[PDB]
Amino acid sequence: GAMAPSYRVKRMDIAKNDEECVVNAANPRGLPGDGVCKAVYKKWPESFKNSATPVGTAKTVMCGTYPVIHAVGPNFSNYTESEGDRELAAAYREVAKEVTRLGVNSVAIPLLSTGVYSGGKDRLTQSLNHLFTAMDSTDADVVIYCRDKEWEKKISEAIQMRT
Numbered sequence: 001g002a003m004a005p006s007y008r009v010k011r012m013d014i015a016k017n018d019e020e021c022v023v024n025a026a027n028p029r030g031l032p033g034d035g036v037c038k039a040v041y042k043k044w045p046e047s048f049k050n051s052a053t054p055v056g057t058a059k060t061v062m063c064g065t066y067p068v069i070h071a072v073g074p075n076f077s078n079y080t081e082s083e084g085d086r087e088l089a090a091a092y093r094e095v096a097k098e099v100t101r102l103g104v105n106s107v108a109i110p111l112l113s114t115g116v117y118s119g120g121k122d123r124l125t126q127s128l129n130h131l132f133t134a135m136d137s138t139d140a141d142v143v144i145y146c147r148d149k150e151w152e153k154k155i156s157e158a159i160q161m162r163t
């Protein structure tokens with residue numbers, strides 16, 4: 001465990017993280033994809049061997065000794081708001097199980113089901129609250145990665161609010 005488990009947010013490419021493992025915002029088929037998924041494929045392509053997994057699950061594949069946790073959030077283009085919310089919460093619960101099993105002291109994590117899988121809606125708060133629900137009982141240092149300057153400020157405010 002971390003000595004004083006924390007949440008932090010950074011605005012940069014998650015492929016350049018300083019944590020002991022990474023969460024990929026994966027597709028169900030283990031394809032190189034777009035966005036976070038493509039950056040992860042370029043950095044850790046070996047981790048995409050047998051990485052396909054259903055929506056609402058996470059599957060870890062090692063790149064050398066570095067763990068890549070492929071977490072598959074729902075595409076809100078295809079799911080109802082209700083079913084999509086259930087699967088997005090479940091994906092993060094599976095990430096917490098994997099982080100715990102691996103015994104890492106730190107994890108780099110993107111906000112699942114934002115961007116391409118958002119179905120054109122702002123899901124910062126919905127996705128971040130499901131991240132917190134899952135990760136609050138873990139003792140890893142969590143570092144959230146984002147690309148947008150306004151998102152960085154809003155995520156930083158939500159972290160600081162509960163401290």
Ligand SMILES: O=C(c1cccc(O)c1)N1CCOCC1
Nearest residue numbers: 114115118120121122123148151
């Ligand atoms: O998921 C979204 C988003 C936000 C609002 C509307 C929309 O159609 C999509 N974004 C990813 C993070 O950077 C901001 C944009």
Ligand SMILES: [Cl-]
Nearest residue numbers: 011012013016
């Ligand atoms: Cl960067």
Ligand SMILES: [Cl-]
Nearest residue numbers: 114115116117
């Ligand atoms: Cl996404």
Ligand SMILES: [Cl-]
Nearest residue numbers: 146147148151
């Ligand atoms: Cl972002």
